[PDB]
Design a protein around this ligand. Sequence first.
Ligand SMILES: */C=C/C(=O)N1CCC(C(=O)NCC(=O)N2CCN(c3nc(-c4cnc(N)nc4C(F)F)nc(N4CCOCC4)n3)CC2)CC1
Length: 855
Amino acid sequence: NREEKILNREIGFAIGMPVCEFDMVKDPEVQDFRRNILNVCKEAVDLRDLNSPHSRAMYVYPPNVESSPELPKHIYNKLDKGQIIVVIWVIVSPNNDKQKYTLKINHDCVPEQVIAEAIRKKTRSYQGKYILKVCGCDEYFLEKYPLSQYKYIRSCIMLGRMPNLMLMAKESLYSQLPMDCFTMPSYSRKSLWVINSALRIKILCATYVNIYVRTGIYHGGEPLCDNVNTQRVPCSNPRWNEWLNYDIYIPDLPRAARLCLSICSVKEEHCPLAWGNINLFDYTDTLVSGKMALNLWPVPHGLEDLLNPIGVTGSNPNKETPCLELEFDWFSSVVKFPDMSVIEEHANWSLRENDKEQLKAISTRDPLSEITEQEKDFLWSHRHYCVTIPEILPKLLLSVKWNSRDEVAQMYCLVKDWPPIKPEQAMELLDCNYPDPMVRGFAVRCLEKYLTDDKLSQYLIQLVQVLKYEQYLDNLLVRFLLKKALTNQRIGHFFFWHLKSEMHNKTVSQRFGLLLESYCRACGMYLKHLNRQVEAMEKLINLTDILKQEKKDETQKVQMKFLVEQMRRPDFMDALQGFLSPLNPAHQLGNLRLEECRIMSSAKRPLWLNWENPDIMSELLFQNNEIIFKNGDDLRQDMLTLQIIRIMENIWQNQGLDLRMLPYGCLSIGDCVGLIEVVRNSHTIMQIQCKGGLKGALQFNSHTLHQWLKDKNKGEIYDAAIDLFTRSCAGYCVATFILGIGDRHNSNIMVKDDGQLFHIDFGHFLDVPFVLTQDFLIVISTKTREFERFQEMCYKAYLAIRQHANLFINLFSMMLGSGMPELQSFDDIAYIRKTLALDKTEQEALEYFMKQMND
Ligand SMILES: */C=C/C(=O)N1CCC(C(=O)NCC(=O)N2CCN(c3nc(-c4cnc(N)nc4C(F)F)nc(N4CCOCC4)n3)CC2)CC1
């Protein structure tokens, strides 16, 4: 049909590759995924069309709310007797005159009550036929949440700013909602464990080789038996035809067993050349048999062993690579993995107070803390009591002998009825350590039952990452993520972008490509806006690449002239004008203010772009939006660091210490190509010093910052600015120490006109003292009550963050999958286990941090 073809073209533009390439993939799992994934799209669409137009309006404009309605003590105290002052705006007449109405109302009021009191205050001079929009952006208060629970409202209460909302007729918004029509695509319409034998595989021959073959059987990262080296054969004739036998009975193979192979050379000096991984069982539970051709992958940098087990599974798309031919035993009939019923049958067939408290203390430990064989057998002998302390499930799982079908079946049974645990603890069961499908299903159930969409957006990147650890295209994790992304556009935006930002990686090009196909097919009208964003980023990448490639070594003004010339090309202006900000899709970006765009030139010619805000009430939020488009350096590290900083600020706020951090927006959109939010009214310390040097030929003294702030904050604003600086500074001190952020200096740090301090450009982390300039110490006031409160702040924040070491360590263990340089093995993560003194006690870690900050 016509709709099908147009949708195919748009989806191909959005994903990068055309839809027709997926059809030519003669892979049963690929077509089966493309077809079976559509049930999730159908569920999402039905949930959208369920409750008439309000359901769609909620799908497109979901509430940006905190997970808990309860306010911290200090946040509530900032309220006027538990109430908040709110300005509600109304546009009247065709001229659209803006009339404000100020109200003082209970912080826990529903938007309906707010609208009611607003109409009351307005008539002193309906029937719920209105809704509340945020003045200056496309965020809506469509749900009966308590106002204070909306992130915007809680932010206004924390910042002392006053919330400005616009009253808007509901019909005016529903008229702006397209009648979406998701069209179903055109591509939709035995022996068991009886084998009882040892596993053996024939390595046949290898092509495209320019030595021996090392192989092993693994369950996730652990080997189910010893590795087997084949006969060292000359590279001229890469023909082994050898048979490799392993110390593993065939039915003893767990469900997620994997064959990991690589080709090594010798000088003495063993060196890998090309690696590969194969699923012993396919997506239909069938045990693979017969001949099989696997194209290998190039080696990643800094590989310790001669094998890459943690690497993706599947044949290299580029078939012009090393190709290894293999042979698997073929028995009576097609072998399948047993049904859960046979598992339960074979499982049924197959205690002191001090010991229970020992189990509890074990569960308390952090993930990276190793467990001993004695402790493993101890947890296993007490596997049933561990159900009472559920958060020990990760270590219990780690204590299993996955090469024994008996223990595997009994653990399956224990999982089928295992109690649910917190999402922060359920994510630990999804990294590379736990490839078992039942464990991952339990974790996905925990997430589905106990994860708010706020917390989902807060951890969306880690989940998109752990997607790579999935044994098969079709699994419960991807279906959960896809349902949420197709029922919540705020989540689907960063879902799509986290996926697309890695389409360049042929390791996951297939998986993410198919997932993006399904999403774009079911996402609705937002595909047009995503396409406009993609074309804008395309033009920006073109301009940045061309800039350096052809004009790199010109002067600032000549590069500026060329940038103004090419940026004015109509095919370019149309592309970069009138679209949604990928950093925050609620932000419209209208026409470019070219007079305000420039090339920073600090590193790799970053672009500083400036758009007008076309919002009807842009002036009440910001009339201009600024973004740094950087094509050059990797921003994934920055994304993760800013996420962790936001989480630390959330912890501190919910624990009762107001250390205002600044986790500004940062989004990697492609191979080292990304965007960065621009914090208004912010300058680097080096900028302050240069502006305050007061001498063309003289150096720059430190005592300038306090003077600059006092100038920018005169009167009663002075103490407030000093407090803001001190608190934000203590927060960032503790953050940078714990995370081991790279070299700080006078331009890595920034301050705002009201005193807030923050950091930028997190080059390398996890590889130790703060700058603590005489500037900072003079702003705080060495021997004053101010510094006493400062040290108290720092110690309290260090303890608060030490209390969530499990969460932070799990976040890093999940990000391990992404090919980030400063994060390649658990050894890099151990730096946090160091700086937080996990193996020490509370008082011990307190003394440790005191001494570390004394230096
Ligand atoms: C002393 C005299 C002299 O020679 N000069 C006067 C001042 C000098 C100077 O200050 N140079 C540094 C500078 O002003 N800027 C560079 C940094 N930049 C900025 N960078 C980033 C960022 C973050 N993360 C990454 N990975 N990369 C970058 C960067 F490549 F863009 N982010 C920001 N923003 C600012 C707004 O809020 C959010 C963060 N800014 C600012 C300019 C120069 C001459």
